[PDB]
C-alpha cells in the first residue's frame, strides 16, 4: 500500500478511537486522543481505561482494528524519516 493511504487509514483509526472513548466513557477529547494512541501503540499505561461493558467491547474493536494499522504506519514513517 502507498504510504499516504496508510496515513489515512491510521487517521481514521484515531478518529474512531477518540470519538468512541469520549462518548462511551465520557472522558475529554484530549484525554481520549491520548488514550487512543497509548492503546493502539500497545503502551497501555492504564491511567485511563474503559470501566463500562460497552467501553470494554469498543476497546476490543479498537485493539483489533488499530494495532496492526498503527504498526504498519510507524514502519512506513521509518522509511521517510530514515
Residues at the contact surface with a second copy, assessed by CB under 8 A: 1, 9, 30-31, 33-34, 37-39, 41-47, 49-51, 53, 56-57, 59-60, 63-64, 67-69, 72, 74-75, 77-78, 82
With binding defined as CB under 5 A, does residue 44 bind K ion? yes
* Residue in this structure with the C-alpha cell 477518540, named with its chain if needed: 18
Specify the residue, 15 or 41, whose C-beta has the smaller distance to a second copy: 41
Cβ atoms of 6 and 28 within 8 Å: the answer is: no
DSSP state of 61: H
**65: phi then psi, degrees, rounded to nearest 5:** -85, -25
The contact set with K ion (CB under 5 A) reads: 42, 44, 46
Amino acid at each position: 500500500v502507498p504510504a499516504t493511504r496508510i496515513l489515512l487509514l491510521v487517521l481514521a483509526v484515531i478518529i474512531y478511537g477518540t470519538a468512541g472513548f469520549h462518548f462511551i466513557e465520557g472522558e475529554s477529547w484530549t484525554v481520549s486522543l491520548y488514550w487512543t494512541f497509548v492503546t493502539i501503540a500497545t503502551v497501555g499505561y492504564g491511567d485511563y481505561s474503559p470501566s463500562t461493558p460497552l467501553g470494554m467491547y469498543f476497546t476490543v474493536t479498537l485493539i483489533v482494528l488499530g494495532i496492526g494499522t498503527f504498526a504498519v504506519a510507524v514502519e512506513r514513517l521509518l522509511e521517510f524519516l530514515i
